[PDB]
Structure formats: structure tokens, C-alpha cells
Design a binder for this molecule. Structure first.
Ligand SMILES: N[C@@H](O)Cc1c[nH]c2ccccc12
Ligand SMILES: N[C@@H](O)Cc1c[nH]c2ccccc12
Ligand SMILES: [Zn+2]
Ligand SMILES: [Zn+2]
Lengths: 361, 115, 361, 109
């Protein structure tokens, strides 16, 4: 009477989908991406990502890209580091792209696995412990460049105002900009002036990223900025997130993917906790603070629900927060975020959630 | 009723050992996207309360993705050990698939049972 | 000042060691064996076993054998079913033995992965889904025989009184006995008369195994026996585990590796629960019943602690029980078992625990 | 305890304590390989009131121990201060980089 069939597409429209990267740290060889509908909390499917996978969605919304490591016998045998291309609607494997055996194995910060604005290149962090940035040509399905200039730097911040340019944060407190040619090789590069004191005021790597500038928060609650609207990157800061009452109770940021920018309003979202001191920089949010980046003033503060990571959808004015297992959905169209729902048990050990792209820009 | 079919107590799930596909992005008779149906399965009969008839149910798995982890069931009505192999549910019915990794399990209605 | 060293042996003597096979069903590609000291609950080490591993210790106590499945890309690519030989004291991999791609994938009943009494051959269950019993010559490192004569049968019960003989339970309600030759190939075989009615009184596969006979319990609380003191297996039963008071409360057995025999006393240990009906044969133990197999009477009943599986050590007069995550250690030197300790969090999803062998082969 | 995340020398551990995994603070559990590199922390020893440099070597080539998970962050810094960073796999230079557990090895004052 009935027959079990495969070949099916994800049941909910792309515009409803979010991606929860479950590291499954307790069983890290079985990491995976869980696909959820953020409107109703429904589980839609998943993509297996082996040991410590990383994930992003193609800017055009058609494909899921993963990065992972295999070994012939898991804990022994030959290593294969790969990027995989998966169909977004069928959640099927399409293509493996071979990487040199040095892709970063680490927690899922957004900046370790990114793409150029034009979507033609995947840009990823290598650490073996030799550091460089690797470039994958999506069209060709090939690893095409290894950016030596990035040794001693960390993470990738794409420039949304240019098709194939990105920045990385260097160990001297400045930023390195890389501009790729149409073949994905380095065409030019530039180093900014020093933005922050590495010893005295280290920044979290997560950018609050605007179209032509990026903001960063520091371990002590200062804000730095990099403006890339012109030919060269202009840096500034610090300004403090903290008023006098804030400072008196030692409020500071903490988290992983801990900031976000709502580009239309210029509001920056930051996870914060009181009683800050050495060693608290990854503490769960006691609060989410909402900062106006033009006025440099806090415009809202709400309970943090122990969140550690966030992401923002510009188009729908939404912020997702994630405490490691549960995803909170907030309407951020107004200065005070409004909690819409919580998706419980979205992951066992996730520090990264992302929206499916809507439109193509 | 989505809520109803997602319960281990749903009538046709009477010998399910595994995660219900209907909670994993599929349905009772379709694999979640990117998982492959098993060509073989364990079988059992389950009594349908709505018409008072017993039906042969084929408990096919979906395969080639890692464990869904949602809606785990371990129901054992009429289940028998491996010396009655096609009635036995403590084995992976993905065992003959191109990829044997177990993702979720389904309950597919074959037809009326022999009385 | 200090240096990190490796290459160390397990810190407790072999006589203290037990093996908890953790299927990790929620992440079944990362199954593993956890090694514990039963005297103090100390975690001693582990052996990774990939997808749905099976495990046993060599009869001479020198090696750990595992059985597992790999694929080149875990969820795609070519399949490799293997036995691995691991050193028992160093917990290191020694060698892989290739199997045909049909080793049993299923829950960890003892009888799916066994060895001949002499320890020369590993004897394992296959399902393609046609069933057969595979024979591996450990020293040669080769799969040497496929006992397709066991089609329609299931599980391996070694005869502890002969070097290279084992039995399996067949769909005709009898046992099939296989005797291997010097190279591991089948030499002779025989089918018993019918022991149990498959339709009317199905047995659990787990034997309560003596040196010359095996007892089995049924879904309805009866006991059957297969005597292999001679070359022809002689079968008997049923006798009931249940008195009239027991019957009135519908007590029945339930569990996985649910029985055991203390050979010196003839006491059989069985997991039982009240209110038995169709579908309750894998329910956790409300009680453990202790039966004298000679007098056919119950001699003790104790709380079951929701146990599902057990194992017996003959020389130290111990029983271990396991509820899926915790292991209970009992002294069974007297008819009434005495609970000595519980090891909490020994596994996430284990249905099998085993002692390190101490007799010698 | 030394099996507690609050033990003084475990002040920048992101991982499972090897002393809970069949090893000790300075020895890998049987069959896991010591990492040659590590992140480094500075931890206060209450016994003598002095700070010690601690090298957080991993043990590698076996799957996750799962016991005594810690996420302490004293003096930990991001990846642009590479060897002070503990959100990367310090098994990365091992023959097999599967992460098993983390040790807390005293380098000196
Ligand atoms: N001490 C580290 O090696 C454990 C670890 C932390 N984050 C990771 C990410 C991937 C792999 C291992 C780790
Ligand atoms: N319905 C089965 O495929 C689910 C399952 C039950 N026990 C197993 C053991 C191993 C693998 C899968 C299973
Ligand atoms: Zn009926
Ligand atoms: Zn100090």
C-alpha cells in the first residue's frame, strides 16, 4: 500500500531556515549541522560533518558548504581535509574539494570559514600550527591559494563593499587586508595602522560587521573600529561600552560569536556579564546590551538567557541567540529586542547559528 | 496528526527501535532529505484501533546520515529474536545499504495481516 | 618541573578490570569500550570502535578484540568491516583483519562476537541479511571460514568444554553445533532435536552457560537446557521460573544479556519484572531472581535497579549488572547477592559489560 | 582534588582532564599520544603563593574521553596570540589529531 521514498526536499521555504552547527564535542567525530525552521521550531534535516565540522551557506542560497576532516580509520590512517558542497534543498552531497591537511580544527567562530562577497571564493583559516588563509575556487572546485602574508594573523572578515576582499586580525594589533584577483590569487594587500593594544586591550575576533566598516569589542568593554570605505583601512578606538555604574559592577563582554550589527539602525548587540576579571571572557551572557554606534550610548539591556553566540538577519530584523543547546529568536526591529520563541534542544554543543540567506545581497 | 504520529504509542509504531523519521525532517513514509531508504526491513503486525484490523508494517530505515537523535522509540510488540530474523529489531536494517549508517526508522503499511 | 609522557600501561592489574561497551547510540559512529576498575570505580582507559563496535577480551587475557565498520567518508564511500586486535595493557592498536562487508550491525549481545574456547579463532555473527557465522584465525590475521550452514540461525554459544566448538540457535527451535578443524574450517556439525516452540515459547538468546550445558529462559518465564557433555546435544524443558504467586502477578523475564550462571553452585541469575505481556521482553529488571537449577526453585530475589544486562565472574563470585549507564557490582558467593558498589556514568548507552578473563586459557 | 576544574593548575583547560581519563596530570591515558605543542597558561598555586607557567598538552589519537570537561580561561587569548589560545585543537601536530584529553604540565615559575 505504501512505499518509503527518498529524494525529497526540505519541507519549509528557504526563508524560514536556520543552521545550528552542532560540534557534539563529547563525540566530536560526529559533528553535524541541524537545519531548523525558526518560525515554528521544526527540525527540517541535517548534514553530517565528521570531526569538528564547520559550515556556511552560499551567498546565493543554493548550496551548503562544509569543511571537515576524515581519516581512513578515524583515529588512524591517512588524513583528508575537505570542503564539501551540499545541495541546500535536497541536503545531499555534491562535491568534495581537497584541502592541504592543515585546516583549522577549533570551535566554530564565524571567521574561520567564510566566503567572498561575490560568492566565488571560500576563504578559510589554516592552523597546523602553521597559519595562513586558504582560498577555494567554488566554480573550479579547487584549492587555489594559500596566503602566506596572513601568518601570525587570525580569522577572516569579508568586506561587504568589495567582491573579493577580506581582512584578518594580526598579532601586532593591526589588520591585514587581502584583495584577490579573479583567479583567487592575492592581487594586492595592505596593513592598517595598529588598532588595539594586544597586551592591554585584546579584542574578541567576532566582528560587528557593517557594509563598509567593522566594530570589535574588547575584553575590558571597549570598542574599536575599522573603516574600509576608502582605499585603505582606517582604524579608531577605543570608546567604552560602559557608563560609571556599569564600571562599578565590573561589567564586561563575554561569549564566542558574541556581537552583531543591525546595519539599518547602527545598533550593536553584545553579550555582557558583571564581575568581570581575568578568565571571564567566555562567560554566558547575563544580559544583551544594545548600543547605538553613532551616539556611543546603550539604548537597551535585556536578560541574556545564558547566551554565548548570536547572529543577525538584516532583512527580517531578527537576532538569534544560542546558549549551547537552545536557540532564542528575537525581533530587533525596535531598540528593545523582543523574544519571540525558544527552540529547545536544537543542539548538544553548538556555538554557532546562521540564517539561510534571502535574496542575493 | 503530526503530534500523534510522532509518539511511540502511535498504532503503527508497535515494533520501532530507533528514531522516528517523522521527527527527523521526513514523514512516516518518506526519508528526511539526503537519507536513503533501506531495501530490507523487519516486519510486524500492528492492530489498528480505528478499524479493528491488524496490518503488516514494514520498518524500513533511512540510511547514509548519522543518528537523527529525535523521538527515540524502543517498542517491541510481537518482536522476536534474531533466529526469527525478519521479526527482529535489535539489528540495523540499513545493513545492506550502500551506506549502512543508521539515520532514522519508518513504519510503512504493507497491507492487511493474515488473521 | 614536568614532562608529559605516553606509552603507559593500564594502571590497575588485569584482575580488577571490566569492559563497558558503550554503543553511544545517539552518536553511533563514535562507539567505544570503557575500561573500569570494578574494585573502586576508577576509569582506566578506552578503545575507540567507530560505528556500532563489538568487543571481547582474548581468553588468555592478553588482547582486546573489536569488530566495527568504517567507510572512506563515514556516510559515503567504500565499506570496510574489520576485526581489530588491541594490546590489553597498552590499549593500542596492533592489527586489522579484513571481513566481508556483512558483519552484524546490532545491539551488543555477547553471542554476536565470541571466540573458540582455545582462543585461536574469533567467531562472529554475519547478516547480509542472510545469516552466517564468520571465523577469523587471530594469529594468521585472516578471515578463514564462513559458516553458511548457520543460515536461519542466530548467535554464537561457545562450548566451554571443547577447544573449537560452538552452537547457534535456529529458526526450527533447535540448536546447531559446529566443530572446526585445525585451520578453522568446518569439520562436523549436528542439529539437536527441537528444544523450544518458536511460536509458542520463544527463548531469549542469552545463555546461562555452564561448562557442559546451557540454560535459556523464555518470554513466558520457562527454562530450557541444552546439554553438550557429549558430542550429541540433548535438549530439555520447559520448567517454570514461576510459582503460583508469581504467575498471578504475570512475572516474566526481561532484558538483553539478561541471565548468568554461577557454575560452582548451579545458581542461575535472571532479570524479571511484573505485569508481563506481549512487548515487555526488553523491560528493565524490577528484580533479580536467583534460581537453583538442580532443585528448580528460587533461592533469592532482590531489587533489580532497572538493570538490563549482566555478567558473572566465576572465581571471584561476582555479578555485574548494567542499566544502560551505571554498573552495579554484587558479591554472589552466597545465595542472596550483596550489592558492593555502583559505578555511575560508566556509559551513555551500554547493554554489555564483561570481566577481564583471569583463569588463563 | 586534581580531578576538579577548580584545581589550581587547570586554570586554562578547554577539554577533558586526562587525570579523569585513565592518565594523570602529566601522563597520557594508555594508547593516546602526547602532543608536542600546547597552549600555555599562568596559574596561581595556593600552596606557595606563586604563579606557574602551565603547558596544556593534549593526548591524542583516541576519541573524546568525555569525563571532567573543563572550560577555564585564565590568561587565555584569541587566535592572533596563537599559543595562548585554547579554542583550537592542540592535537593539530600529532600523527592523528583526534582529541582525547588535556593535561596540565608544570613548566616552572
Ligand atoms: N584542548 C583542546 O585541544 C581541546 C579542544 C578545544 N577546542 C577544540 C576544538 C576542536 C578540537 C579540539 C578542541
Ligand atoms: N531500526 C534499526 O535500524 C535501528 C537500530 C536498532 N538497533 C540498532 C543497532 C545498530 C544500528 C541500528 C539499530
Ligand atoms: Zn488485532
Ligand atoms: Zn598569583
Amino acid at each position: 500500500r505504501e512505499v518509503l521514498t527518498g529524494g525529497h526536499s526540505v519541507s519549509a521555504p528557504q526563508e524560514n531556515r536556520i543552521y545550528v552547527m552542532d560540534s557534539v564535542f563529547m563525540h566530536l567525530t560526529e559533528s553535524r549541522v541541524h537545519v531548523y525552521d525558526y518560525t515554528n521550531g521544526k527540525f527540517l534535516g541535517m548534514v553530517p560533518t565528521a570531526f569538528n565540522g564547520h559550515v556556511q551557506v552560499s551567498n546565493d542560497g543554493k548550496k551548503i558548504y562544509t569543511m571537515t576532516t576524515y581519516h581512513e580509520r578515524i583515529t588512524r590512517g591517512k588524513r583528508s581535509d575537505v570542503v564539501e558542497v551540499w545541495d541546500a534543498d535536497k541536503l545531499t552531497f555534491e562535491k568534495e574539494i581537497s584541502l592541504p591537511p592543515k585546516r583549522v580544527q577549533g570551535l566554530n567562530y564565524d571567521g574561520l570559514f567564510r566566503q567572498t562577497t561575490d560568492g566565488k571564493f571560500i576563504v578559510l583559516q589554516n592552523a597546523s600550527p602553521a597559519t595562513s588563509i586558504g582560498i577555494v575556487d567554488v566554480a573550479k572546485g579547487d584549492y587555489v591559494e594559500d596566503v602566506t602574508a596572513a601568518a601570525g594573523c587570525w580569522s577572516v572578515i569579508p568586506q561587504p563593499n568589495r567582491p573579493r576582499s577580506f581582512m584578518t586580525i594580526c598579532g601586532d594589533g593591526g589588520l591585514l587586508t587581502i584583495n584577490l584577483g579573479e583567479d583567487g590569487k592575492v592581487a594586492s594587500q595592505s596593513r592598517s595602522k595598529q588598532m588595539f593594544s594586544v597586551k592591554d586591550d585584546p579584542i574578541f575576533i567576532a566582528p560587528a560587521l557593517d557594509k563598509d566598516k567593522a566594530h570589535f569589542v574588547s575584553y575590558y568593554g571597549n570598542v574599536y573600529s575599522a573603516d574600509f570605505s576608502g582605499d585603505e583601512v582606517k582604524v579608531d578606538g577605543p570608546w567604552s561600552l560602559l557608563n560609571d555604574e556599569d564600571k562599578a559592577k565590573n561589567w564586561v563582554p563575554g561569549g564566542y560569536n558574541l556581537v552583531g550589527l543591525h546595519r539599518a539602525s547602527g545598533r550593536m548587540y553584545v553579550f555582557m556579564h558583571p564581575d568581570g576579571k581575568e578568565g571571564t571572557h567566555k562567560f554566558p551572557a547575563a544580559e544583551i546590551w544594545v548600543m547605538d554606534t553613532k551616539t556611543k550610548q546603550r539604548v537597551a539591556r535585556i536578560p541574556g538567557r545564558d547566551a554565548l553566540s548570536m547572529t543577525i538577519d538584516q532583512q527580517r530584523n531578527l537576532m538569534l541567540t544560542l546558549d549551547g543547546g537552545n536557540v532564542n529568536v528575537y525581533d530587533i526591529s525596535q531598540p528593545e529586542p523582543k523574544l519571540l520563541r525558544t527552540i529547545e534542544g536544537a543542539a548538544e554543543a553548538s556555538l554557532q547559528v546562521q540564517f539561510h540567506p534571502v535574496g542575493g545581497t | 496528526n503530526e503530534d500523534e504520529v510522532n509518539s511511540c504509542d502511535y498504532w503503527r509504531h508497535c515494533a520501532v527501535d530507533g528514531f522516528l523519521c517523522s521527527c527527523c525532517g521526513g514523514t512516516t513514509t518518506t526519508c528526511p532529505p539526503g537519507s536513503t531508504p533501506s531495501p530490507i526491513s523487519w516486519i510486524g503486525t500492528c492492530h489498528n484501533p480505528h478499524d479493528g484490523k491488524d496490518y503488516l508494517i514494514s520498518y524500513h530505515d533511512c540510511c547514509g546520515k548519522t543518528a537523527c537523535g529525535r523521538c527515540q522509540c524502543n517498542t517491541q510488540t510481537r518482536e522476536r529474536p534474531g533466529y526469527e530474523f525478519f521479526l527482529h529489531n535489535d539489528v540495523n536494517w540499513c545493513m545492506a545499504n550502500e551506506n549502512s549508517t543508521f539515520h532514522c526508522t519508518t513504519s510503512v503499511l504493507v497491507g492487511l495481516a493474515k488473521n
